[PDB]
Amino acid sequence: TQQPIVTGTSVISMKYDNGVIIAADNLGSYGSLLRFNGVERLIPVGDNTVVGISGDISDMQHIERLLKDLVTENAYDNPLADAEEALEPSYIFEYLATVMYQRRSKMNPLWNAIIVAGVQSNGDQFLRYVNLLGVTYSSPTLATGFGAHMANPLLRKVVDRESDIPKTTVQVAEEAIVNAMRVLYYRDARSSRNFSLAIIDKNTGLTFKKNLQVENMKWDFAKDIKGYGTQK
Amino acid sequence: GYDRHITIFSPEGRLYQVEYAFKATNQTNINSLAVRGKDCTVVISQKKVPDKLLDPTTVSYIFCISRTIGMVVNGPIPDARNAALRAKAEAAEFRYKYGYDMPCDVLAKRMANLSQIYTQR
């Protein structure tokens, strides 16, 4: 059957002219109760791809197993059958898709929502979305969970089409993910102040900045109004 | 006939029953003086108590109808109490349905309208 048990928040992400950034907060909540903090939801597969997994934490672990098995299969046989048949993001993406789809038909699915973000070996930016249902779509900016229809609006104003990718840089995206995270921590009850951030660059590789706190926060407007409306 | 015994109009067009009401508020012999300051309003009133056996503290004519609005009464104390009770009820009600306490202007107008109804009946 399967339904929400212990559930993560949102993975948010965007492209720029030389790569993509992808970030998520560290939470496995048991609904309102925030029962686990410090549980990382970005999972790197090789150094050209980070997969950000949302939804249920249980299923996440069990895809942690499948990504790790995958690296093993690729390494198998020749050592040269993984140097120029090395993994692309597009492979990881498709594999994850088809298992989810067929598991939904057995009626006990992997309850996840996933972003596969990476860069190809030709240098192309790769950001594409899959979910338990098996719906596939690409977008220049993508997010999952609550932040797919909350955080994502802001992000899409930076990049709305494929033409606005050359108008965005690694330091523009950098500011906007920090900002979309602050929006997330503010207006979502499921959130952690902690967040980890990975950047996949094609020029400089995987740079994995972990365990940032939300900064530039404001609460200076909470002294000015008290009561629920009627009370002055 | 009954043009002075109930609140119906007379050939004069003047309601005698109503006139009698004003001829009973000056028979308690209480004077009041009310002045507007520059930041306040002050009202002083008589409180003549001629008895040893009446407690003078409980003899009063200034009733607080709101926490901000006082009311000073010249005339009989049964009718004073009834008008105070009604006014307090309305002032509370105004807070409840309009989200702020009843103004002095409108509290005056509300008792004014009830007085007309009491001389309509």
Question: Is A139 within 8 Å of A149 (Cβ atoms)?
Answer: no
A228's tokens: 């629920």
Closest CA to B65 of B110, B119, B118: B110
From CA A215, how far away is CA A209, in angstroms rounded? 15
The experimental technique behind this entry is cryo-EM
- Cα(A129)–Cα(A53) distance, integer angstroms: 10
Locate A195 and state its tokens.
């967040």
Which residue carries 């930076």 as its tokens?
Answer: A158
Q: What region does A177 belong to: left with phi over 0, alpha with psi -120 to 50, or beta?
A: alpha
d(CA A149, CA A143): 8
Residues composing chain B = 121
- B62: three-class secondary structure by DSSP: strand
Distance CA A22, CA A27 (A): 16
Q: How far apart are the first and last CA of chain B?
A: 17
Tokens of A224: 């000015």
Cα separations in angstroms, A27 against A147, B45, B86: 14, 71, 59
Per the listing, tokens 């006014």 go with B87
| Helices A57-75 and A89-105: angle between axes, nearest 10 degrees | 130
Cβ count within 10 A of residue A192: 22
Residues in chain A, total:
232
Active site residues of A: 1
Please give the backbone phi and psi of residue A54, each rounded to the nearest 5 degrees, phi first. -130, 175
SS3 assignment, position A192: coil
Rounded to 5 degrees, φ, ψ at A122 are -95, -10
Instruction: Give CA–CA dist A173/A16, Å, rounded.
Output: 7
The closest of A16, A12, A14 to A204, measured between CA atoms, is: A16
The answer to whether the CB of A151 falls within 8 A of the CB of A136 is no
CB A39 within 8 A of CB A56: no
What type of residue is B10? S
To one decimal, the resolution in angstroms is: 5.4
CA–CA dist A84, A32 (Å, integer): 47
The answer to whether the CB of A47 falls within 8 A of the CB of A137 is no
CA A48 to chain centre: 15
Residue with tokens 């309003």: B41
